[PDB]
Amino acid sequence: GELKAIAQELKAIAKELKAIAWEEKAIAQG
Amino acid sequence: GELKAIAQELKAIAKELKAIAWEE
Amino acid sequence: GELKAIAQELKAIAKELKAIAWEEKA
Amino acid sequence: GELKAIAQELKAIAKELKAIAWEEKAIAQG
Amino acid sequence: GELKAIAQELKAIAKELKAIAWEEKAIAQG
Amino acid sequence: GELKAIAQELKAIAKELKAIAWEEKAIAQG
């Protein structure tokens, strides 16, 4: 169903945001 | 239906965040 | 309907993220 | 009720992303 | 209800994006 | 239920945005 599809996209979005934070952390260090 | 439309916009959102994560 | 309104705001959000992603960096 | 409240928060989110885009544009142009 | 919980998380999300816009502004002006 | 799952992913998204705001702050300050 579509509510499950929505939850799955939000999970993917959280994962991408986590990756963005991790990359920014490297920039902040350097 | 609108729930499908919502899921499709979230997919577009994930795609652009994936580009942001990747770049630079 | 409010579901349509939600879909329309998410479309606007995708569009702003597309602009953010694809603005050429200095 | 709550679906309207959700729509209103998404509008606020779009507005903040527009501000982010505007400031990144300024970073790019400095 | 969970719809209220969703609205409350979107409010938190808007608040974090406002913080991000302010920090991009600091980068632009810094 | 899936509405709860959606709320939980939005909570994760708020947390990652908080991390991004922190890292942008770190970039702004060197």
**Are residues B2 and C7 in contact, defined by beta-carbon separation less than 8 angstroms?**
yes
**Cα C25 from Cα C17, distance rounded (Å):** 15
Of D2, D23, D30, the CB nearest to E4: D2
* Method by which the coordinates were obtained: X-ray
Cβ–Cβ gap C7/B10 under 8 Å: no
Assess B3–C contact: CB distance below 8 Å, yes or no. yes
Radius of gyration of chain F (CA): 13
DSSP string for A1-30: -HHHHHHHHHHHHHHHHHHHHHHHHHHHH-
All residues of chain F having their beta carbon less than 8 Å from the beta carbon of residue E30 are: 28
Assess C24–B contact: CB distance below 8 Å, yes or no. no
